[PDB]
Design an enzyme around this catalytic site. Sequence first.
Site, PDB file in Angstrom:
ATOM      1  N   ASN A  12      -0.421 -11.680  -9.452  1.00 34.85           N
ATOM      2  CA  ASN A  12      -0.985 -12.847  -8.786  1.00 34.85           C
ATOM      3  C   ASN A  12      -2.395 -13.143  -9.286  1.00 34.85           C
ATOM      4  O   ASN A  12      -3.112 -12.255  -9.758  1.00 34.85           O
ATOM      5  CB  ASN A  12      -0.965 -12.671  -7.260  1.00 34.85           C
ATOM      6  CG  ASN A  12       0.410 -12.965  -6.674  1.00 34.85           C
ATOM      7  OD1 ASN A  12       1.404 -12.909  -7.392  1.00 34.85           O
ATOM      8  ND2 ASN A  12       0.468 -13.341  -5.394  1.00 34.85           N
ATOM      9  N   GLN A  45      -5.070 -17.110  -4.686  1.00 37.59           N
ATOM     10  CA  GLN A  45      -5.916 -16.534  -3.648  1.00 37.59           C
ATOM     11  C   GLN A  45      -7.343 -16.397  -4.164  1.00 37.59           C
ATOM     12  O   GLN A  45      -7.572 -16.177  -5.358  1.00 37.59           O
ATOM     13  CB  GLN A  45      -5.373 -15.179  -3.170  1.00 37.59           C
ATOM     14  CG  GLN A  45      -4.098 -15.322  -2.348  1.00 37.59           C
ATOM     15  CD  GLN A  45      -3.633 -14.025  -1.735  1.00 37.59           C
ATOM     16  OE1 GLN A  45      -3.739 -12.967  -2.349  1.00 37.59           O
ATOM     17  NE2 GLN A  45      -3.097 -14.102  -0.519  1.00 37.59           N
ATOM     18  N   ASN A  65      -6.546 -17.796   1.397  1.00 38.23           N
ATOM     19  CA  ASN A  65      -5.432 -18.486   0.770  1.00 38.23           C
ATOM     20  C   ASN A  65      -5.820 -19.936   0.482  1.00 38.23           C
ATOM     21  O   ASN A  65      -6.920 -20.388   0.809  1.00 38.23           O
ATOM     22  CB  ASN A  65      -4.176 -18.392   1.639  1.00 38.23           C
ATOM     23  CG  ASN A  65      -4.315 -19.102   2.981  1.00 38.23           C
ATOM     24  OD1 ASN A  65      -5.215 -19.914   3.194  1.00 38.23           O
ATOM     25  ND2 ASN A  65      -3.406 -18.797   3.894  1.00 38.23           N
ATOM     26  N   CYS A  74      -3.179  -5.133   3.400  1.00 39.64           N
ATOM     27  CA  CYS A  74      -3.836  -3.897   2.985  1.00 39.64           C
ATOM     28  C   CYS A  74      -3.851  -3.747   1.468  1.00 39.64           C
ATOM     29  O   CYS A  74      -2.829  -3.929   0.800  1.00 39.64           O
ATOM     30  CB  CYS A  74      -3.142  -2.695   3.634  1.00 39.64           C
ATOM     31  SG  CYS A  74      -1.415  -2.425   3.141  1.00 39.64           S
ATOM     32  N   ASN A  76      -4.972  -5.582  -0.837  1.00 41.50           N
ATOM     33  CA  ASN A  76      -4.844  -6.774  -1.664  1.00 41.50           C
ATOM     34  C   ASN A  76      -6.118  -7.011  -2.466  1.00 41.50           C
ATOM     35  O   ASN A  76      -7.229  -6.918  -1.935  1.00 41.50           O
ATOM     36  CB  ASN A  76      -4.532  -7.987  -0.787  1.00 41.50           C
ATOM     37  CG  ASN A  76      -3.807  -9.081  -1.543  1.00 41.50           C
ATOM     38  OD1 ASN A  76      -3.015  -8.810  -2.446  1.00 41.50           O
ATOM     39  ND2 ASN A  76      -4.074 -10.329  -1.173  1.00 41.50           N
ATOM     40  N   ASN A 158       4.427   0.593   6.214  1.00 40.73           N
ATOM     41  CA  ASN A 158       5.558  -0.310   6.328  1.00 40.73           C
ATOM     42  C   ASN A 158       6.848   0.429   5.996  1.00 40.73           C
ATOM     43  O   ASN A 158       6.831   1.443   5.287  1.00 40.73           O
ATOM     44  CB  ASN A 158       5.389  -1.516   5.393  1.00 40.73           C
ATOM     45  CG  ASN A 158       4.826  -1.131   4.041  1.00 40.73           C
ATOM     46  OD1 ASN A 158       4.252  -0.055   3.876  1.00 40.73           O
ATOM     47  ND2 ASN A 158       4.985  -2.015   3.066  1.00 40.73           N
ATOM     48  N   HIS A 160      10.430   1.366   4.253  1.00 38.83           N
ATOM     49  CA  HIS A 160      10.985   1.279   2.911  1.00 38.83           C
ATOM     50  C   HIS A 160      12.285   2.066   2.823  1.00 38.83           C
ATOM     51  O   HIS A 160      12.373   3.196   3.312  1.00 38.83           O
ATOM     52  CB  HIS A 160      10.002   1.810   1.864  1.00 38.83           C
ATOM     53  CG  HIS A 160       8.795   0.946   1.674  1.00 38.83           C
ATOM     54  ND1 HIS A 160       8.786  -0.141   0.827  1.00 38.83           N
ATOM     55  CD2 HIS A 160       7.555   1.014   2.213  1.00 38.83           C
ATOM     56  CE1 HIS A 160       7.593  -0.709   0.857  1.00 38.83           C
ATOM     57  NE2 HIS A 160       6.828  -0.027   1.690  1.00 38.83           N
ATOM     58  N   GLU A 209      11.485  -7.542  -0.871  1.00 35.45           N
ATOM     59  CA  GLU A 209      10.509  -7.235   0.166  1.00 35.45           C
ATOM     60  C   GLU A 209      11.081  -7.505   1.559  1.00 35.45           C
ATOM     61  O   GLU A 209      12.183  -8.038   1.722  1.00 35.45           O
ATOM     62  CB  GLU A 209       9.222  -8.035  -0.047  1.00 35.45           C
ATOM     63  CG  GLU A 209       8.299  -7.464  -1.115  1.00 35.45           C
ATOM     64  CD  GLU A 209       6.830  -7.625  -0.765  1.00 35.45           C
ATOM     65  OE1 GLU A 209       6.500  -7.592   0.439  1.00 35.45           O
ATOM     66  OE2 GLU A 209       6.006  -7.784  -1.691  1.00 35.45           O
ATOM     67  N   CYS A 218       5.257  -5.641  -5.813  1.00 35.99           N
ATOM     68  CA  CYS A 218       5.070  -5.116  -4.465  1.00 35.99           C
ATOM     69  C   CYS A 218       4.597  -3.676  -4.606  1.00 35.99           C
ATOM     70  O   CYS A 218       5.399  -2.788  -4.918  1.00 35.99           O
ATOM     71  CB  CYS A 218       6.362  -5.203  -3.653  1.00 35.99           C
ATOM     72  SG  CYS A 218       6.353  -4.263  -2.112  1.00 35.99           S
ATOM     73  N   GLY A 219       3.298  -3.447  -4.400  1.00 35.80           N
ATOM     74  CA  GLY A 219       2.765  -2.106  -4.556  1.00 35.80           C
ATOM     75  C   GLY A 219       3.308  -1.146  -3.517  1.00 35.80           C
ATOM     76  O   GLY A 219       3.517   0.036  -3.792  1.00 35.80           O
ATOM     77  N   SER A 220       3.554  -1.636  -2.311  1.00 31.83           N
ATOM     78  CA  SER A 220       4.153  -0.786  -1.292  1.00 31.83           C
ATOM     79  C   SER A 220       5.470  -0.176  -1.768  1.00 31.83           C
ATOM     80  O   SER A 220       5.707   1.019  -1.568  1.00 31.83           O
ATOM     81  CB  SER A 220       4.353  -1.592  -0.021  1.00 31.83           C
ATOM     82  OG  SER A 220       5.137  -2.725  -0.325  1.00 31.83           O
ATOM     83  N   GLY A 221       6.326  -0.961  -2.428  1.00 29.90           N
ATOM     84  CA  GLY A 221       7.619  -0.429  -2.841  1.00 29.90           C
ATOM     85  C   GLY A 221       7.526   0.528  -4.019  1.00 29.90           C
ATOM     86  O   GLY A 221       8.331   1.458  -4.150  1.00 29.90           O
TER      87      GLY A 221
END
Lengths: 275, 160
Positions: A12, A45, A65, A74, A76, A158, A160, A209, A218-221
Amino acid sequence: SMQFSKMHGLGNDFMVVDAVTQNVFFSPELIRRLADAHLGVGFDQLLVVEPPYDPELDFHYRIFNADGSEVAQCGNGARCFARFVRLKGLTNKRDIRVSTANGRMVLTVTDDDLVRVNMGEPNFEPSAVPFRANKAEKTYIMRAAEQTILCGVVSMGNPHCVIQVDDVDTAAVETLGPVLESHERFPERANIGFMQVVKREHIRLRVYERGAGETQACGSGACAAVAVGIQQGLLAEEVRVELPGGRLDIAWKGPGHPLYMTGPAVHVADGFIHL
Amino acid sequence: SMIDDDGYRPNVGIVICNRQGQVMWARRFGQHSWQFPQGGINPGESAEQAMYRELFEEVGLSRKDVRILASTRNWLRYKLPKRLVRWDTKPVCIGQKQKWFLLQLVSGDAEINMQTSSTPEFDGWRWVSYWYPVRQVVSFKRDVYRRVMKEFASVVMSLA
Ligand SMILES: Nc1nc2c(ncn2[C@@H]2O[C@H](COP(=O)(O)OP(=O)(O)O)[C@@H](O)[C@H]2O)c(=O)[nH]1
Ligand SMILES: [Cl-]
Ligand SMILES: [F-]
Ligand SMILES: [Mg+2]
Ligand SMILES: [Mg+2]
Ligand SMILES: [Mg+2]
Protein backbone atom coordinates in the site's frame (compact mmCIF):
# COMPACT_ATOMS: atom_id res chain seq x y z
CA SER A 1 5.72 24.86 0.50
CA MET A 2 5.04 21.84 2.70
CA GLN A 3 7.33 18.95 1.81
CA PHE A 4 6.38 15.29 1.78
CA SER A 5 7.47 11.90 0.48
CA LYS A 6 5.71 9.03 -1.24
CA MET A 7 6.55 5.61 0.19
CA HIS A 8 5.34 2.05 -0.33
CA GLY A 9 4.99 -0.72 2.24
CA LEU A 10 2.86 -3.86 2.69
CA GLY A 11 1.59 -3.38 -0.85
CA ASN A 12 0.00 0.00 0.00
CA ASP A 13 1.02 3.54 -0.89
CA PHE A 14 1.82 6.05 1.86
CA MET A 15 2.14 9.81 1.67
CA VAL A 16 4.55 10.62 4.51
CA VAL A 17 4.87 14.14 5.93
CA ASP A 18 7.44 15.37 8.46
CA ALA A 19 5.20 17.34 10.85
CA VAL A 20 8.04 17.65 13.38
CA THR A 21 10.12 20.36 11.70
CA GLN A 22 7.02 21.67 9.85
CA ASN A 23 3.99 23.58 11.22
CA VAL A 24 1.08 21.75 9.56
CA PHE A 25 -2.35 20.98 11.00
CA PHE A 26 -4.25 18.20 9.23
CA SER A 27 -7.90 19.11 9.42
CA PRO A 28 -10.12 16.48 7.74
CA GLU A 29 -10.87 19.06 5.04
CA LEU A 30 -7.16 19.44 4.27
CA ILE A 31 -6.74 15.65 4.29
CA ARG A 32 -9.59 15.22 1.80
CA ARG A 33 -8.00 17.83 -0.47
CA LEU A 34 -4.58 16.15 -0.40
CA ALA A 35 -6.22 12.79 -1.11
CA ASP A 36 -7.40 14.19 -4.46
CA ALA A 37 -4.97 13.04 -7.14
CA HIS A 38 -5.57 16.14 -9.30
CA LEU A 39 -6.02 18.99 -6.82
CA GLY A 40 -3.65 17.53 -4.24
CA VAL A 41 -1.26 14.60 -3.94
CA GLY A 42 -3.05 11.29 -4.31
CA PHE A 43 -2.49 8.61 -1.70
CA ASP A 44 -4.16 5.57 -0.23
CA GLN A 45 -3.21 6.54 3.35
CA LEU A 46 -1.45 9.56 4.87
CA LEU A 47 1.27 9.07 7.51
CA VAL A 48 2.08 12.09 9.69
CA VAL A 49 5.23 12.06 11.85
CA GLU A 50 4.72 14.16 14.99
CA PRO A 51 6.72 15.00 18.11
CA PRO A 52 6.13 12.49 20.91
CA TYR A 53 3.60 12.98 23.68
CA ASP A 54 5.80 11.10 26.18
CA PRO A 55 9.38 12.24 26.92
CA GLU A 56 10.66 8.65 26.84
CA LEU A 57 9.46 8.07 23.25
CA ASP A 58 11.05 9.41 20.07
CA PHE A 59 8.02 10.19 17.88
CA HIS A 60 4.28 9.82 17.53
CA TYR A 61 2.68 9.20 14.16
CA ARG A 62 -0.88 9.12 12.84
CA ILE A 63 -2.46 7.55 9.77
CA PHE A 64 -5.46 9.09 7.99
CA ASN A 65 -7.56 7.68 5.17
CA ALA A 66 -8.75 9.54 2.08
CA ASP A 67 -12.03 10.32 3.86
CA GLY A 68 -10.05 12.38 6.38
CA SER A 69 -10.50 10.00 9.32
CA GLU A 70 -7.83 8.61 11.63
CA VAL A 71 -7.04 4.91 11.11
CA ALA A 72 -6.11 2.77 14.14
CA GLN A 73 -4.87 -0.60 12.84
CA CYS A 74 -2.02 -2.20 14.76
CA GLY A 75 1.43 -1.84 13.22
CA ASN A 76 0.15 -0.03 10.12
CA GLY A 77 2.82 1.99 8.34
CA ALA A 78 5.49 1.10 10.92
CA ARG A 79 8.01 0.17 8.22
CA CYS A 80 7.75 3.39 6.20
CA PHE A 81 7.75 5.55 9.34
CA ALA A 82 10.97 4.05 10.69
CA ARG A 83 12.80 4.41 7.38
CA PHE A 84 11.39 7.91 6.89
CA VAL A 85 12.62 9.43 10.16
CA ARG A 86 16.09 8.08 9.32
CA LEU A 87 16.07 9.19 5.67
CA LYS A 88 15.01 12.71 6.67
CA GLY A 89 17.65 12.87 9.41
CA LEU A 90 15.04 13.28 12.16
CA THR A 91 16.86 10.54 14.10
CA ASN A 92 19.95 8.35 13.84
CA LYS A 93 18.80 5.56 16.17
CA ARG A 94 18.17 2.04 14.91
CA ASP A 95 15.67 1.13 17.67
CA ILE A 96 12.91 3.75 17.37
CA ARG A 97 10.42 4.13 20.22
CA VAL A 98 7.15 5.54 18.90
CA SER A 99 3.51 5.87 19.94
CA THR A 100 0.51 5.37 17.66
CA ALA A 101 -3.27 5.30 17.99
CA ASN A 102 -2.97 1.68 19.21
CA GLY A 103 -0.22 2.16 21.82
CA ARG A 104 3.57 2.21 21.64
CA MET A 105 6.06 -0.01 19.81
CA VAL A 106 9.82 -0.29 19.40
CA LEU A 107 10.96 -0.51 15.78
CA THR A 108 14.43 -1.77 14.85
CA VAL A 109 16.07 -0.88 11.54
CA THR A 110 18.46 -3.62 10.43
CA ASP A 111 21.61 -2.44 8.67
CA ASP A 112 20.26 -3.72 5.36
CA ASP A 113 17.70 -0.95 6.06
CA LEU A 114 14.55 -3.02 6.64
CA VAL A 115 12.22 -2.71 9.61
CA ARG A 116 11.71 -5.29 12.37
CA VAL A 117 8.54 -5.33 14.50
CA ASN A 118 7.85 -7.33 17.65
CA MET A 119 4.25 -8.55 17.46
CA GLY A 120 4.10 -10.56 20.69
CA GLU A 121 3.90 -14.23 21.57
CA PRO A 122 1.29 -16.07 19.47
CA ASN A 123 -1.43 -17.87 21.42
CA PHE A 124 -2.88 -21.27 20.49
CA GLU A 125 -5.42 -21.32 23.34
CA PRO A 126 -8.76 -21.95 21.56
CA SER A 127 -10.58 -19.84 24.18
CA ALA A 128 -8.62 -16.77 23.02
CA VAL A 129 -8.76 -17.19 19.22
CA PRO A 130 -11.79 -17.95 19.69
CA PHE A 131 -12.25 -21.53 18.46
CA ARG A 132 -14.91 -24.15 19.16
CA ALA A 133 -12.57 -26.87 20.43
CA ASN A 134 -11.88 -29.00 23.47
CA LYS A 135 -8.21 -27.91 23.76
CA ALA A 136 -5.17 -27.08 21.66
CA GLU A 137 -3.58 -29.44 19.14
CA LYS A 138 -0.90 -28.89 16.51
CA THR A 139 -3.58 -29.52 13.88
CA TYR A 140 -7.36 -29.78 13.84
CA ILE A 141 -9.95 -31.41 11.60
CA MET A 142 -12.84 -29.35 10.21
CA ARG A 143 -15.36 -30.49 7.61
CA ALA A 144 -15.86 -27.61 5.19
CA ALA A 145 -19.29 -28.62 3.81
CA GLU A 146 -18.69 -31.65 1.50
CA GLN A 147 -14.91 -31.46 1.99
CA THR A 148 -12.63 -32.53 4.83
CA ILE A 149 -9.44 -30.63 5.70
CA LEU A 150 -6.90 -30.18 8.51
CA CYS A 151 -5.65 -26.93 10.01
CA GLY A 152 -3.82 -25.18 12.76
CA VAL A 153 -5.39 -22.18 14.46
CA VAL A 154 -3.65 -19.38 16.36
CA SER A 155 -4.39 -15.91 17.70
CA MET A 156 -2.09 -12.90 17.28
CA GLY A 157 -4.64 -10.43 18.57
CA ASN A 158 -6.89 -11.56 15.72
CA PRO A 159 -8.07 -15.08 14.81
CA HIS A 160 -6.24 -17.10 12.18
CA CYS A 161 -6.80 -20.51 10.59
CA VAL A 162 -4.08 -22.03 8.41
CA ILE A 163 -4.02 -24.87 5.87
CA GLN A 164 -1.18 -26.38 3.85
CA VAL A 165 -1.69 -26.08 0.09
CA ASP A 166 0.77 -27.59 -2.36
CA ASP A 167 0.88 -24.37 -4.47
CA VAL A 168 -0.89 -21.04 -3.96
CA ASP A 169 -2.07 -20.40 -7.49
CA THR A 170 -3.46 -23.96 -7.17
CA ALA A 171 -5.88 -22.68 -4.56
CA ALA A 172 -9.66 -22.62 -4.53
CA VAL A 173 -9.43 -19.59 -2.22
CA GLU A 174 -12.58 -17.98 -3.63
CA THR A 175 -14.76 -20.99 -2.77
CA LEU A 176 -13.04 -22.40 0.32
CA GLY A 177 -11.99 -19.05 1.82
CA PRO A 178 -15.49 -17.71 2.54
CA VAL A 179 -16.74 -21.03 3.95
CA LEU A 180 -14.10 -21.19 6.69
CA GLU A 181 -14.07 -17.42 7.18
CA SER A 182 -17.70 -17.73 8.30
CA HIS A 183 -17.44 -21.16 9.94
CA GLU A 184 -19.53 -22.23 12.93
CA ARG A 185 -16.42 -22.83 15.06
CA PHE A 186 -15.22 -19.21 14.60
CA PRO A 187 -17.68 -17.07 16.61
CA GLU A 188 -15.67 -13.95 15.68
CA ARG A 189 -14.74 -15.34 12.23
CA ALA A 190 -11.09 -15.87 11.27
CA ASN A 191 -8.44 -14.93 8.73
CA ILE A 192 -7.77 -18.07 6.71
CA GLY A 193 -4.34 -18.68 5.21
CA PHE A 194 -3.20 -20.94 2.38
CA MET A 195 0.36 -22.03 3.02
CA GLN A 196 2.59 -23.63 0.34
CA VAL A 197 5.79 -24.93 1.91
CA VAL A 198 8.72 -24.70 -0.51
CA LYS A 199 11.51 -25.24 2.05
CA ARG A 200 11.87 -25.33 5.85
CA GLU A 201 12.68 -21.59 5.64
CA HIS A 202 10.72 -20.41 2.57
CA ILE A 203 6.96 -20.11 2.16
CA ARG A 204 4.53 -18.84 -0.47
CA LEU A 205 1.14 -17.85 0.89
CA ARG A 206 -2.15 -16.14 0.10
CA VAL A 207 -4.57 -14.76 2.70
CA TYR A 208 -8.36 -14.40 2.61
CA GLU A 209 -8.69 -11.81 5.37
CA ARG A 210 -11.37 -11.84 8.04
CA GLY A 211 -13.84 -9.46 6.41
CA ALA A 212 -12.15 -8.04 3.32
CA GLY A 213 -11.01 -11.19 1.53
CA GLU A 214 -7.64 -11.33 -0.23
CA THR A 215 -5.43 -8.25 -0.04
CA GLN A 216 -1.97 -7.53 -1.44
CA ALA A 217 -0.37 -8.04 1.98
CA CYS A 218 -1.73 -9.13 5.36
CA GLY A 219 1.05 -9.12 7.94
CA SER A 220 -1.18 -10.76 10.53
CA GLY A 221 -1.56 -13.85 8.33
CA ALA A 222 2.13 -14.08 7.46
CA CYS A 223 3.10 -14.39 11.13
CA ALA A 224 0.18 -16.75 11.78
CA ALA A 225 1.14 -19.30 9.12
CA VAL A 226 4.78 -19.28 10.23
CA ALA A 227 3.73 -19.40 13.89
CA VAL A 228 1.95 -22.73 13.47
CA GLY A 229 4.24 -24.22 10.81
CA ILE A 230 6.79 -24.23 13.62
CA GLN A 231 4.36 -25.30 16.34
CA GLN A 232 3.37 -28.05 13.91
CA GLY A 233 7.10 -28.69 13.40
CA LEU A 234 7.43 -28.10 9.64
CA LEU A 235 9.56 -24.94 9.63
CA ALA A 236 12.66 -23.39 11.16
CA GLU A 237 13.40 -20.47 13.45
CA GLU A 238 13.32 -17.98 10.56
CA VAL A 239 11.10 -18.15 7.49
CA ARG A 240 10.94 -16.11 4.29
CA VAL A 241 7.34 -15.36 3.26
CA GLU A 242 6.29 -14.50 -0.32
CA LEU A 243 2.85 -12.90 -0.78
CA PRO A 244 1.36 -11.04 -3.78
CA GLY A 245 2.35 -7.75 -2.11
CA GLY A 246 6.00 -8.63 -1.58
CA ARG A 247 8.35 -10.50 0.74
CA LEU A 248 8.37 -10.71 4.54
CA ASP A 249 10.92 -12.34 6.85
CA ILE A 250 9.59 -13.78 10.10
CA ALA A 251 11.38 -14.97 13.23
CA TRP A 252 10.22 -16.86 16.33
CA LYS A 253 11.97 -19.12 18.87
CA GLY A 254 8.78 -20.89 19.96
CA PRO A 255 6.51 -20.59 23.00
CA GLY A 256 7.84 -18.32 25.72
CA HIS A 257 9.33 -16.03 23.06
CA PRO A 258 7.90 -13.13 21.05
CA LEU A 259 7.47 -13.29 17.29
CA TYR A 260 9.34 -10.74 15.16
CA MET A 261 8.41 -9.73 11.61
CA THR A 262 10.75 -7.88 9.24
CA GLY A 263 9.65 -6.16 6.04
CA PRO A 264 10.64 -3.58 3.44
CA ALA A 265 9.78 0.07 2.92
CA VAL A 266 10.72 1.76 -0.36
CA HIS A 267 11.14 5.54 -0.69
CA VAL A 268 9.33 6.31 -3.94
CA ALA A 269 9.50 10.09 -4.39
CA ASP A 270 9.75 13.49 -2.70
CA GLY A 271 7.34 16.37 -3.12
CA PHE A 272 6.36 19.98 -2.65
CA ILE A 273 2.88 21.42 -2.30
CA HIS A 274 1.54 24.84 -1.31
CA LEU A 275 -1.44 24.80 1.04
CA SER B 1 17.30 49.53 28.48
CA MET B 2 18.48 47.09 25.79
CA ILE B 3 15.08 46.69 24.10
CA ASP B 4 15.30 47.87 20.50
CA ASP B 5 12.91 50.31 18.83
CA ASP B 6 10.65 47.54 17.53
CA GLY B 7 10.29 46.28 21.11
CA TYR B 8 12.40 43.12 21.31
CA ARG B 9 14.61 42.36 24.31
CA PRO B 10 17.90 40.67 23.31
CA ASN B 11 17.98 37.16 24.72
CA VAL B 12 19.98 33.92 24.71
CA GLY B 13 18.60 30.38 24.73
CA ILE B 14 20.31 27.17 25.82
CA VAL B 15 19.75 23.60 24.60
CA ILE B 16 21.75 21.24 26.83
CA CYS B 17 22.14 17.75 25.38
CA ASN B 18 23.85 14.73 26.92
CA ARG B 19 25.75 11.81 25.41
CA GLN B 20 22.53 9.90 24.63
CA GLY B 21 21.02 12.71 22.56
CA GLN B 22 18.51 13.70 25.23
CA VAL B 23 17.99 17.37 26.06
CA MET B 24 17.41 19.22 29.33
CA TRP B 25 13.82 20.18 30.19
CA ALA B 26 13.54 22.62 33.12
CA ARG B 27 10.38 23.52 35.04
CA ARG B 28 9.66 27.15 35.87
CA PHE B 29 9.74 28.10 39.55
CA GLY B 30 6.37 27.59 41.21
CA GLN B 31 4.71 26.81 37.87
CA HIS B 32 3.57 23.88 35.75
CA SER B 33 5.22 24.85 32.46
CA TRP B 34 8.62 23.61 31.28
CA GLN B 35 11.10 25.09 28.81
CA PHE B 36 14.74 25.47 27.83
CA PRO B 37 16.88 27.86 29.89
CA GLN B 38 16.88 31.34 28.38
CA GLY B 39 18.07 34.66 29.73
CA GLY B 40 18.28 38.32 28.89
CA ILE B 41 21.42 39.95 27.55
CA ASN B 42 22.89 42.53 29.91
CA PRO B 43 24.46 45.90 28.99
CA GLY B 44 27.99 45.43 27.70
CA GLU B 45 28.15 41.64 27.42
CA SER B 46 28.15 39.59 24.23
CA ALA B 47 25.75 36.71 23.57
CA GLU B 48 28.26 34.01 24.53
CA GLN B 49 29.06 35.93 27.75
CA ALA B 50 25.33 36.17 28.62
CA MET B 51 24.93 32.46 27.83
CA TYR B 52 27.64 31.41 30.30
CA ARG B 53 26.26 33.70 33.01
CA GLU B 54 22.66 32.50 32.64
CA LEU B 55 23.90 28.90 32.40
CA PHE B 56 25.51 29.12 35.84
CA GLU B 57 22.81 31.39 37.29
CA GLU B 58 19.93 29.02 36.52
CA VAL B 59 21.51 25.61 35.83
CA GLY B 60 24.63 25.91 37.99
CA LEU B 61 27.02 24.74 35.28
CA SER B 62 30.49 26.22 34.80
CA ARG B 63 32.45 26.76 31.58
CA LYS B 64 34.21 23.44 32.23
CA ASP B 65 30.87 21.67 32.75
CA VAL B 66 29.81 22.08 29.10
CA ARG B 67 31.21 22.30 25.58
CA ILE B 68 29.70 24.53 22.89
CA LEU B 69 28.59 22.40 19.92
CA ALA B 70 26.79 24.97 17.75
CA SER B 71 24.80 28.20 17.73
CA THR B 72 22.28 29.80 15.39
CA ARG B 73 23.47 32.25 12.74
CA ASN B 74 21.26 35.26 13.45
CA TRP B 75 18.43 36.12 15.82
CA LEU B 76 15.05 34.43 16.15
CA ARG B 77 12.08 36.43 17.40
CA TYR B 78 8.77 35.69 19.08
CA LYS B 79 6.05 38.11 20.19
CA LEU B 80 4.62 37.84 23.67
CA PRO B 81 0.90 37.24 24.11
CA LYS B 82 -0.51 40.75 24.08
CA ARG B 83 -2.38 39.63 27.23
CA LEU B 84 1.00 39.70 29.09
CA VAL B 85 2.80 42.71 27.62
CA ARG B 86 3.05 45.14 30.55
CA TRP B 87 2.06 48.26 28.59
CA ASP B 88 2.62 50.65 31.53
CA THR B 89 6.40 50.00 31.83
CA LYS B 90 8.28 51.96 29.14
CA PRO B 91 10.00 51.27 26.85
CA VAL B 92 7.66 48.26 26.82
CA CYS B 93 8.90 44.88 25.45
CA ILE B 94 6.50 43.25 22.94
CA GLY B 95 8.79 40.34 22.14
CA GLN B 96 12.21 38.75 22.52
CA LYS B 97 15.05 38.40 20.01
CA GLN B 98 17.15 35.37 20.94
CA LYS B 99 20.33 33.67 19.79
CA TRP B 100 20.39 29.98 20.67
CA PHE B 101 23.28 27.79 21.82
CA LEU B 102 23.58 24.00 21.75
CA LEU B 103 25.82 22.69 24.53
CA GLN B 104 26.85 19.11 25.45
CA LEU B 105 27.13 18.39 29.21
CA VAL B 106 30.63 16.98 29.64
CA SER B 107 30.41 16.67 33.44
CA GLY B 108 28.14 14.32 35.35
CA ASP B 109 24.49 15.00 36.05
CA ALA B 110 25.38 15.92 39.65
CA GLU B 111 26.95 19.21 38.51
CA ILE B 112 23.48 20.60 37.74
CA ASN B 113 22.16 22.86 40.50
CA MET B 114 19.27 25.28 40.08
CA GLN B 115 19.85 26.85 43.53
CA THR B 116 22.96 28.90 42.68
CA SER B 117 20.58 31.85 42.58
CA SER B 118 18.99 33.92 45.26
CA THR B 119 16.11 34.08 42.82
CA PRO B 120 15.85 30.77 41.00
CA GLU B 121 13.87 30.56 37.80
CA PHE B 122 13.72 26.75 37.77
CA ASP B 123 12.94 24.23 40.50
CA GLY B 124 13.10 20.98 38.52
CA TRP B 125 14.68 19.39 35.49
CA ARG B 126 14.78 16.12 33.57
CA TRP B 127 16.13 14.60 30.39
CA VAL B 128 13.61 14.35 27.55
CA SER B 129 13.74 12.98 24.03
CA TYR B 130 15.13 15.40 21.47
CA TRP B 131 11.87 16.36 19.75
CA TYR B 132 9.72 16.34 22.91
CA PRO B 133 10.24 20.10 23.58
CA VAL B 134 8.71 21.09 20.22
CA ARG B 135 5.32 19.69 21.20
CA GLN B 136 5.49 20.58 24.89
CA VAL B 137 6.64 24.20 24.78
CA VAL B 138 4.19 27.06 25.29
CA SER B 139 2.53 27.95 22.01
CA PHE B 140 4.02 31.40 21.42
CA LYS B 141 7.54 29.87 21.55
CA ARG B 142 6.80 26.88 19.31
CA ASP B 143 7.92 28.27 15.94
CA VAL B 144 11.26 29.38 17.39
CA TYR B 145 11.69 26.01 19.11
CA ARG B 146 10.89 24.09 15.92
CA ARG B 147 13.42 26.12 13.93
CA VAL B 148 16.09 25.70 16.63
CA MET B 149 15.64 21.94 16.97
CA LYS B 150 15.65 21.70 13.17
CA GLU B 151 18.94 23.60 12.95
CA PHE B 152 20.59 21.69 15.83
CA ALA B 153 19.34 18.21 14.92
CA SER B 154 22.21 17.34 12.56
CA VAL B 155 24.82 17.98 15.26
CA VAL B 156 23.06 15.93 17.95
CA MET B 157 22.39 12.97 15.64
CA SER B 158 26.03 12.84 14.48
CA LEU B 159 27.14 11.90 18.01
CA ALA B 160 26.67 8.50 19.66
N1 LIG C 1 4.29 34.04 31.72
C1 LIG C 1 5.32 33.74 30.94
N2 LIG C 1 6.19 34.76 30.67
C2 LIG C 1 7.21 34.46 29.83
C3 LIG C 1 7.38 33.15 29.39
N3 LIG C 1 8.50 33.12 28.64
C4 LIG C 1 9.05 34.36 28.60
N4 LIG C 1 8.34 35.06 29.48
C5 LIG C 1 8.74 36.50 29.43
O1 LIG C 1 10.15 36.62 29.45
C6 LIG C 1 10.62 36.78 30.83
C7 LIG C 1 11.49 35.60 31.22
O2 LIG C 1 12.80 36.05 31.25
P1 LIG C 1 13.99 35.17 30.48
O3 LIG C 1 13.78 35.19 28.96
O4 LIG C 1 13.98 33.71 30.99
O5 LIG C 1 15.45 35.89 30.86
P2 LIG C 1 16.13 36.29 32.25
O6 LIG C 1 15.08 36.78 33.19
O7 LIG C 1 17.15 37.36 32.02
O8 LIG C 1 16.79 35.07 32.83
C8 LIG C 1 9.36 36.83 31.69
O9 LIG C 1 9.50 37.83 32.70
C9 LIG C 1 8.26 37.24 30.66
O10 LIG C 1 8.27 38.65 30.43
C10 LIG C 1 6.44 32.18 29.73
O11 LIG C 1 6.58 31.03 29.30
N5 LIG C 1 5.40 32.45 30.51
CL1 LIG D 1 32.78 29.43 35.07
F1 LIG E 1 18.18 36.17 34.72
MG1 LIG F 1 15.93 32.38 32.30
MG1 LIG G 1 17.81 34.10 34.27
MG1 LIG H 1 18.94 37.77 33.48
